Amino acid sequence: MKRVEDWIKQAERDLEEARYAKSGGYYELACFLSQQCAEKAVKGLLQFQGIEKRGHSISHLLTNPPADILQCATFLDKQYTPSRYPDVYYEGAPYEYYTERDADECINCAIRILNWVKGQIK
């Protein structure tokens, strides 16, 4: 069991670890941890709203969110999975093909979703 504040602490710690992973050059990790951040924040919001849905797609968890939030949820939903769906997985060892720009786009979308959720919990 978790309280709303636990979902938000999990998301704040996932963001801190994503930045830490980018500092170490671990860009695929920073992208995974950014998707974890967003997913935990949106589950925190759904609990606060008493509005239960399931799955790990951040986009399917939202209901009529702003355009920028849906764009970042769709973007983050592509991060680790997807055996072959959301398909665009890399061939070979994935980490070798991520870049510092991907880490920045993933971290910043996690920050956009985490702040948008915080704004709504009151």
CA distance 97 to 91: 9
Here the CATH number for the domain that contains residue 51 is 1.20.120.330
**3 CB contacts (<8 Å, ≥6 apart)?**
47
Which residue do the tokens 């769709």 mark?
A: 74
Which method was it determined by? X-ray
**55 CB contacts (<8 Å, ≥6 apart)?**
61
The experimental resolution of this structure, in angstroms, equals 1.6
CA distance 80 to 94: 10
Q: Please check whether residue 58 is in contact with residue 76, taking contact to mean a CB–CB distance below 8 angstroms.
A: yes
**24 CB contacts (<8 Å, ≥6 apart)?**
none
Strand (E) positions, the chain? none
Residue-number span of the structural domain to which 34 is assigned = 1-122
Q: In angstroms, what is the C-alpha Rg of the chain?
A: 14
- Per the structure, the count of domains in the chain is 1
Task: Tally Cβ neighbours within 10 Å of residue 102.
Answer: 18
